[PDB]
Every structure is written in C-alpha cells, then in structure tokens.
Amino acid sequence: VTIAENCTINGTLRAEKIVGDIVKAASAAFPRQRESSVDWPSGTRTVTVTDD
Amino acid sequence: IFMNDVFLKRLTAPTITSGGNPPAFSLTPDGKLTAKNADISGSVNANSGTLSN
Amino acid sequence: IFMNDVFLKRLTAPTITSGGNPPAFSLTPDGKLTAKNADISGSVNANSGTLSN
Numbered sequence: 001v002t003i004a005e006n007c008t009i010n011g012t013l014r015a016e017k018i019v020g021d022i023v024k025a026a027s028a029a030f031p032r033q034r035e036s037s038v039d040w041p042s043g044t045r046t047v048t049v050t051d052d
Numbered sequence: 053i054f055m056n057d058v059f060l061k062r063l064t065a066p067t068i069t070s071g072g073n074p075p076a077f078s079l080t081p082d083g084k085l086t087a088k089n090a091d092i093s094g095s096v097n098a099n100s101g102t103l104s105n
Numbered sequence: 106i107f108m109n110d111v112f113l114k115r116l117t118a119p120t121i122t123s124g125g126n127p128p129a130f131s132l133t134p135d136g137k138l139t140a141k142n143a144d145i146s147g148s149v150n151a152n153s154g155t156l157s158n
Contacts, residue, residue, distance in 0.1 A: 055113055057115045066124050089147040092149070
C-alpha cells in the first residue's frame with residue numbers, strides 16, 4: 001500500500017517494522033571487575049546501529 | 053427484451069444490474085460500483101479509502 | 106443495435122461503457138475497471154493499492 005497523504009487508524013495498529021520518526025534506544029552497563037568486597041567498572045560495550 | 057446467453061463486442065449501457073432487490077452488483081449512471089467482494093490482480097488506484105480492517 | 110432495457114442470463118462482452126465523454130464507469134478487455142466510487146460490502150483483495158487518504 002502506498003498512501004500519499006494522511007492515514008488514520010481508529011483501532012489498533014499492529015506493525016512489525018516501523019521506519020518513522022520514532023525513537024530507538026539501547027542501553028547497557030559496563031562490566032564490573034571485583035576483588036574481596038569491592039568492584040569497579042572496567043570493560044567495553046559495543047553498540048551497532050544498522051543503516052536500514 | 054428478454055434474451056438468453058448473448059455474445060457481444062461493445063456495450064453502451066448506463067445502468068447495469070445483477071437483478072433483484074438488494075442487487076448483488078450494480079453499476080449506476082453516476083459511476084457507483086456496488087459489489088460484495090472485489091478481487092483484483094493488480095492495483096486499486098483510488099483517491100480515498102474507508103476500510104474497517 | 107439500439108434497445109431499451111433488457112433482461113439477460115449471461116453476457117460476454119469485452120468492452121462495456123456507460124456512455125459519455127469520460128464514461129462514468131468503463132470496463133476494457135485489458136481488465137481495467139474505471140469508476141467514480143466503489144462501495145463493497147465485503148473484502149477487497151488486491152495485489153497493490155495507491156490511495157491518497
């Protein structure tokens with residue numbers, strides 16, 4: 001379907017992929033290295049964004 | 053005029069009916085097409101749409 | 106052949122026209138249905154669609 005202007009759904013829209021102006025979000029915590037009773041952040045996190 | 057199976061080359065009729073009260077399909081002089089289901093193997097190019105689902 | 110209203114069992118015509126400069130509705134041997142509005146009480150199953158709204 002190709003809609004050249006407004007499309008108005010008055011019910012529930014069930015879409016698999018949305019390529020609109022919505023936000024994408026990812027999040028992680030750094031790996032923790034510990035000894036005895038104390039730990040500290042030390043490590044790497046890799047975030048990949050596809051150009052789709 | 054009542055006719056049986058008739059073959060044709062070109063028809064110019066402004067009102068076509070499938071016959072019956074609640075006609076299954078109908079084409080009126082104003083261009084309205086009334087039907088129960090529409091299966092199209094290509095594109096439906098409309099200026100607007102109103103579908104329930 | 107010019108006739109008034111006619112009742113039929115089955116028609117086999119490749120070209121059907123509503124009569125007119127820009128016919129309100131038309132059907133051509135290439136499968137095209139041209140109309141101004143289409144009211145369908147059931148489902149429209151099409152391969153592609155192009156609606157403005």
